[PDB]
Amino acid sequence: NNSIAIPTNFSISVTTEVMPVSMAKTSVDCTMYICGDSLECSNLLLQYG
Amino acid sequence: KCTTKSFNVSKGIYQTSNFRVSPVTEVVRFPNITNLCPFDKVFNATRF
Ligand SMILES: *[C@@H]1O[C@H](CO)[C@@H](O[C@@H]2O[C@H](CO)[C@@H](O)[C@H](O)[C@H]2NC(C)=O)[C@H](O)[C@H]1NC(C)=O
Ligand SMILES: *[C@@H]1O[C@H](CO)[C@@H](O)[C@H](O)[C@H]1NC(C)=O
Incomplete structure (x- = not known):
C-alpha cells in the first residue's frame, strides 16, 4: 500500500504491421466458358441470357 | 449493344x-481405305 515502481530508462522500438488492401480483379466470359466455341450450344444459351 | 442488351x-x-x-x-480428313466390307458374306450366309 506504500510501494511504487518508477522507470529510470527507456528504449525506442520499431514494429512492422502488414495489411492487405486489394485483391486480383477478375472478369469471366459466359459464352467461352459454357459453350466450347460451338454454334449448337450458343443457340440454347440465349434462354439463359 | 448486344452484350449490354439495352440499346x-x-x-x-x-x-x-x-x-x-x-x-x-x-x-474433312479420313484415312484412305477402299475395301468394301463383307456385308454379303456375313448377313446373307448359308446357315445361321
Ligand atoms: C540507458 O541505457 C543506455 C544504453 O541502452 C545508456 O546509454 C549509455 O549512456 C552513456 C552515458 O550515460 C554513454 O556513454 C554510452 O555510450 C551509452 N550507451 C551504452 C551502450 O552504454 C544510458 O546511460 C542509460 N541511462 C540510465 C541508466 O539512466
Ligand atoms: C435510348 O435512349 C434515348 C434517350 O433516353 C431514348 O430516347 C431512346 O429511345 C433509346 N433507344 C432505344 C433504341 O430504345
Missing part, C-alpha cells in the same frame, strides 16, 4: 462477348 450505353468501359469470327469452310 443504350452510358459513359464507361465494358467487356464485350465474342461476335466477330464465324467459320466459312469445312475440313
